[model samples]
Target chain A: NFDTSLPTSHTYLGADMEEFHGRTLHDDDSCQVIPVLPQVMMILIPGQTLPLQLFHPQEVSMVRNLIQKDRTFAVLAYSNVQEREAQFGTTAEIYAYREEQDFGIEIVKVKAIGRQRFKVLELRTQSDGIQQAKVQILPECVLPSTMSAVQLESLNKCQIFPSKPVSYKWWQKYQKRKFHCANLTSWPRWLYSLYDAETLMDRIKKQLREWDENSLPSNPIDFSYRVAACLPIDDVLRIQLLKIGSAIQRLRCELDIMNKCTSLCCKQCQETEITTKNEIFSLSLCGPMAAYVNPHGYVHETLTVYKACNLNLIGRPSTEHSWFPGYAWTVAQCKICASHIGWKFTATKKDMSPQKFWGLTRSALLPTIPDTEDEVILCL
Target chain B: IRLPIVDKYKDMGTVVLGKLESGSICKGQQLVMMPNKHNVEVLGILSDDVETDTVAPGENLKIRLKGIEEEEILPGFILCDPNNLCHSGRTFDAQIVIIEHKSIICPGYNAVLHIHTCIEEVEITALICLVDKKSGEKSKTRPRFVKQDQVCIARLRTAGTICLETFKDFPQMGRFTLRDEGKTIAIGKVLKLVP
Candidate 1:
């Protein structure tokens, strides 16, 4: 079993203009406005992808505002607002959204301004004891274009640049002098290089992946895959394969979208399945034909992570099953998303249940092929 | 990472941010209160990290919140946003707005305490029990069973300006007998006064 444990963090972002000023801060600039929404307070650094849940009224407002407005908000660290405004803050921009009927809401695939900045003007206290922040917004400093694909290779990622040679016709159409002939640049990759590119979703995804690789206490990869599966996108995520340009930006954006899709695709995050090897928790005497809905309204059933639980192993009741029946049976599930983790079922008993055995059952698993029983019956 | 409020069916790629134990609530940390929503106890701290908190953008942690369903906290969500965080002298002063039932000159004079603006809903079930003020004492259909100046349990099915005052200090003043469930029951407030 994997030890999926994480430590605690105190860092919290407030919900409104006023409440943000009341918390511990390093400077007034630590609390600034983000362009993601008309007004918001974020403590995360720019390019840091974080998955969160919003189930309250105030938060619903946040979601609505972000979607209706610029999408991403500012995520200024709130240690203690200090005198300097250039310390650091961010402007998030939500680009994609996933709305699943099973889940009743929309989550933003936000991308924050990777280079833009802002500062707090003054902290004002409202009569209601809530504090509102007055901020000074600023755009990003435009740096010169750096389009050399070789220089990008040093970033340690799959490079996608102008694959074809520049042509006069292509240059005339593109209008841009440098990228005209060698049109290997992808939309996302090109945009990501912009000094002012508001790739909130991109930054967040990259940060999350880095966190995963560094083993930093962050989000789980299964979470991303599960979200992708749940998203009603049906085909959008599958289409989210790495593109030719802005490899880093594209990958990060996809990762962010995948993350948002997990909780919403099915409105199933609240429900969990439990499995154990204990005899009491074992499957009913019946064969693996139906779902086991317990007296407590628990729907305990096994699913394969492969395709319809399409693995060759037994099927457990959930993504993370704790118990597998003593016997063995083949499994099948979706291989695309992690939401349908894996499942296992006990195999047939050739000796004790020979009377129950109808035919051969000692065969391996198979995909959803033609109507044919792949596994042979060892016993009933 | 996505928005704080990850909808199960909406944001398919949403990630749940939380700690493993007790959803990471530290001491001295204050969760923004939902001025009037009386469901704060349900927030904070769990054994393993699973997203649960529904948060807002402004309601922040004064200190690390422990024992809360951190994933449930949404943006703009408050830890405790009760307008009556501070209790009054047993009786909370609020605006009275009579609704639903026809006006009853008698007993209708009792001032109503309006609730928070976010939730402007009137309890219709309470209106069915409003008695007619014209009924005599000997009449079977008395608007409410009450004596002059004696605050007893009177099943006044009412609407509009319905808010409860804490019963801790002004127990007698805060207690109100209304027919909310089609029965003569008592409505009491459940909050502590800070000042």
Candidate 2:
């Protein structure tokens, strides 16, 4: 069979692969074996495109064999050696492939799009060094479109009532009931639609119109993935987004993230505030946040802003190989820890529109979620 | 021969300034503006600010053309041999060296690609292999990410179609610089072209 016996000289004999054999399976009907591609610090969501360039003999052989069959494989988010294998993963289907040879090594370039989510049932390693797993497809939990009269009435009352101080106790009771209802197996379709992908997408679109308005996908599944892929949140939150079963839930989580994150702080110290979200502006066609590389080959994902604080410029401005055509760049470092924060770009020409600006490296700045207690007190 | 249009002006007609990288250009010589593929007849040639009927490689020259307008030609557009145009595409393979970065770079990372005079947004679509710096041996396993001071072969996709040639075929057009946060972070050369 095409699925069996791919040639390879090396074998991946990790101890974690042997541990999965000792675990007992509760269900086997929905399980099927598929090849797994372990990726670090990456979480693929359905409808997202994943491009892969393979050099390993085992990986090359795996892709070659899969091309003849289903052409699908699971992409699992792998942590460091201390952690066990993650349970959730997305299946990717190869749509493009290019095979070439360089320096006596076979290389394969692949373009794959995320297809569906799956939960690993068991993990095993083949003698060829490729990892295979028994997995169960996780179906989307889509609520019905129709809403009953009782649900409609409840939803309306919550919206129409004035959430004042006197009725705060009553409001709390209502929230508890609503939470209880949500915990049940089925929720009202209206509730789902309230946080539906389209509703959340419209809110996000209004919040950030610079996200290439016309090209944004209309499909809920694709839209969810697009936002998840581009959002500047860390990989931990991204994995949570990928593990979400429903589009409504994923969009709701994204909305929460967008609402809470208002400032950028130093990732190293975590206490130093670098800049606010209001200061962000786009200097390139790829939005405000984009990646750039230097002459020596280090890649930095940078966010442009009109003004930034807590930064100190260490070097003189240099116009050599500047990213912006008419700008001179000076190295900007964090004042507290003396870490490389980003750069300060000033216009070289007198007529240049932006006299000066700051580019904060994504690796150095972490998104800060402000305290919610003050906001709660103010609302009250 | 290849001549990348560095600047353009419209005085009597469409005039362009470019340093001829190879071969020669003479008045009445037909050349094609590449990627756009516009055929034009060279009406006048100015070698080093002096009016001349012919020009050779390595000399800066201004050429007045017949077929195309000044507005349509961008700075990076190439004036090349009509029968042998430079390869233009949105995807290619490159061998990149991460000179100085604080973090590891993975796929889906976006950056601005500067090759010759063309500057376009590019994303690291895939990482082929990590290369040994001294021995030049390729990695046997696919790396999840590449870190600072590492050499790796990567697949990069540009946001827009650009004019470029493989390093093996054309060294000048193939070499590129990647800048992020207003700094140069990496440099590479085009190894292969897609389509």
Candidate 3:
């Protein structure tokens, strides 16, 4: 609802090319590009589809060769990513494909709808950007790969039935592992897919049998009867998704480490809190963003200091609270709750005192609260 | 927690006894009360050491002081709000209103000194500056003033540009404050010289 202004994607099916606009009706719809590279992490909203215009000769030819036979493709999102590069990309489905002209470039029209979020593991690309990946996904459903007679018997017993959808909830929340849920069960094929060497090929075979799956899109002239797309990992996260054959096995490995049924039902409830006070505080880490709020409405309010003052930040201790990246120096404590909310971090040589270090910064309120917990003195 | 001022060698660090305008002085101690600057019955203090002085409103009481400038004083010994801060400067200068008999007071943070009942506006220019870097002591802060009244209703300061009025009324812009470390000490309500 807060995003009515985003450029929604629509496909030009059965056409040679797609057209786009920025202002006044030369068709009037221009947009900011959500660029995708094999290394770019992505998160596509269900409604915010992607419209990629392929122009370069080599890549365009690849789309023409492969997509002309079966136009469908995967649209997905990356679950986690460092600002540097995406480990994987989301998976999406192509709704339309067009080869036509618009604005001076030759392009192809492909409309993709998002499926789910994923994490990138490894990505290798051809010099031209054709990407290969082994990624992990927060699967909605999953089936056993190369299922053994013993593993098949254990299928329904996966802890997720108890954890709800999570095949591995314990590790993610505890910084114990990288991902959860593989969503393999949703595929139309199960028992037979166990022996199928290529899951992607079997999926396409399954699609042919389910003629009633009207949601499947096709190229009016040449259609993709090739595959029914797999775990919707983004192009980036997918590359990571592709680097491994059985994400399901990874989950099993993580499960062994997380052994024992989770005791989550304990009176503990997890929450995120950010605290802002006195002088404006800037977070040194991302976790602190959760608890922040503007206490003093922006106006002519005076901040009177009678004693000492300092600056601080709060973030997830596991990730951003690294002492190894360099070393540590600064320290912090909660003024109200006295919670040990921060660590002493090293500062630049120019830094001297807290007041001096924070001198030029504008005043703003910063707050801090729990990131995760099993029990709280305030509650069961 | 005020150490009393002692004038006699026998009571080397004894506290002083002072009286309040409407209250009684208990020899060495001033009855401890919060300073209710907003409203109080007396223009007061107790004949005593800083331990008990007239309290002002809205101000917290940290510790009390006996008399100032005595060996009995300690770093933490405060007059509370009773610890009203003061500073002195060499006959600096100020332009302020002329009260009855022309007595004057400085205006900055929350300074309350009386001017005449007949005078509605006062002119201020400057003040004397005094600071004890070692003890960080606040002493008698006196501001210099130009003479004029008739409820003159207007006053101003003179300088390459004597700044704004502390309380800020027309012929002036606004007010300013002086500080020791980060705490407010004296404030100036400047009134610029104008026709």
Candidate 4:
């Protein structure tokens, strides 16, 4: 039976954090002080699992201290070495913690899941080198059911009278109200329903069913965060999704992104079509796209695809430190402008299912909207 | 008659430099600019670097104008009789010959288009058919890509509006060159204009 193996909450080491662990803080107006862990190139969204191994003594102490009380800390994204840190961050609660000693140095390993988002109100660095912040919780502003049906009907009626006689003052006021209601967060429930989370989840599942169907959460907020965590979008787009406070707006934005970005083009040239969305496939457990570090220590967020066009392979294939086992990689450059794009991987063994695939660097490519009639409306 | 504006100035009034392609222009002659349709009257004319009463075709001349600002006129803008105007659009069909490109040119290939004195970014929207160089025969099927030295009919879309005419009607304005990486890759002539 489906319920036979689901009795306990603590069965797995990566089990989700407790639901009520940080529930009280959301309704509170006062800022809550929490330990802040700054990540160089990572943004944690809600419902996403983050596994971290801390070797620094300050971080180890911070984690050890945090697990005793609430087991919650803020994970803030740091672009580079700068004085100012990113204002937005998500609170991560440790579900599992372990300590290890190697070479007489203490190490801490923690399995955490992202919980609520928070904005840093004040930041301070401790003498021991651990950073702490007083942060205000940012809650999702869900539109209530009371503001849905009747308001939508009245708005629809107003839209039907395109040529009906109306005074200039009344029409101007109506236009102002329409513009005000058109905001992303305040969209009517009926309008949001057209691009709801369930419909969007179904669309994403059809494209890439990397996660289990039954395991997917039904909560709109959780489901939206799960999709945001796995989508092969750029870091900038991901941060924008993290900043949005409405689930329906995020889902609608995701739908628009998925619909418009049907193909990829060379970012340098901006016109050379490299590959289509149909060619994308996952070769790693980190979804169709993930970050990988090279031998020189440069991290590249790469997307795996089955086929690509307008790419000219450069140099001989090398299997040294290959990200994919038993595969060789060769540099790929744009055919038009000859800019370095990514690498082409080929299996050394002939029996491999995918003899060849491409790993396009996310930064080197830009998503392009498919040519449609509506795009030409302005020119016509 | 068409006289494309090559340069503009504001001395006493609006002055323009152009070589007459057809007909003649005289002082006090009323003319209109194509694409923008700015009506102006010629106040003075200078032909062959000398002031003249009337300037004919094939003579480079500078004419002073009224009812238009110097900044309003740009190169490749044509001056014509108020009754006739050149076609202006963002989409057109052309017969192109690839000259020196190494790779195959696909539907989305972009290049800087140079026609008359106007340069704009253009993209190949579709390939109509391939043409045989020896027998002047057209391929029955559409071509996915075109290679060097191949002649083909293609539909091109520009980034902005440009004034042009069919080669059969006006050879000077319809011929164009496609350049990429600062090198000329193809040459073409406009065949048809799209609204």
- Cα shift from native, residue A83, model 4 (Å): 6.1
Candidate 2's TM-score: 0.48
Docking class of 1: incorrect
- Predicted structure 1: lDDT: 0.28
lDDT of 3 by residue, A158-272 (tens): 4232232423243233221111122334333333433333333323334333321123333210111111121111233223323333433323222221222121110111132
Task: Output the number of the lDDT-best candidate.
Answer: 4
- lDDT tens digits by residue: candidate 1, A1-380: 11111100101111112111111212323445443222233333223233333323344456555566545444443434342232334443543332221111222222122222355565554443333445565432222334554243344343333544625454233234333323445454434333222233334434344323222213222222222221222211222321112333333444444343222111123232221111111021111211222111122222212112111222232211122322332232233322232233333444422111111111111111112344111100
Rank by lDDT (best first): 4, 2, 3, 1
Worst 10 residues of 4 chain A by lDDT: A1-10
What DockQ would candidate 2 receive versus the native complex?
0.03
lDDT of 3 by residue, B1-195 (tens): 221111222143333221111212332343332211111122223322343443432222222233323343322112211333211111223322232232433432123211110011222333333322111122234323222221112232222222122232321123333323333323334333243
lDDT of 4 by residue, A1-380 (tens): 12212211222222343333433234534488888764324677787666565655777888887877888888875444434766878888877676754212354656677888888788898877767888988878676433244355546455433453615455455344543345435665345445445545655655556322224576778777776765656555667788888777777677667666778888889878898888876665445665554522234567778899998875567664466766778888799987778889898888876789898887788776678644311100
Better of 1 and 3 by DockQ: 1
TM-score of chain B of each: 0.23, 0.95, 0.21, 0.95
Instruction: State which candidate has the highest DockQ.
Output: 2
In candidate 2 the C-alpha lDDT for residue A31 amounts to 74
- Residues A1-380 of candidate 2 have per-residue lDDT tens digits of 01111111001111111111112122323676878754323466666555455655778888888877778887775444417576877777776666754222355666566677778788898978677988887776665323332344546455434444524366355444443335343775346446545456766665566432325577766676666654566555666787776767777777776677788888888889898867776565334654443432233456778899998875467654455666777888789997778889898778866689887777677776787554311100
Error of 3 at A36 (Å): 8.3
What Cα-based lDDT does every candidate model obtain?
A: 0.28, 0.68, 0.29, 0.70
Query: Between 1 and 2, whose DockQ is larger?
Result: 2
If the candidates were sorted by their TM-score against the true structure, best first, what order would they fall in?
2, 4, 1, 3
Superposition error at A366 for model 3 (Å) = 14
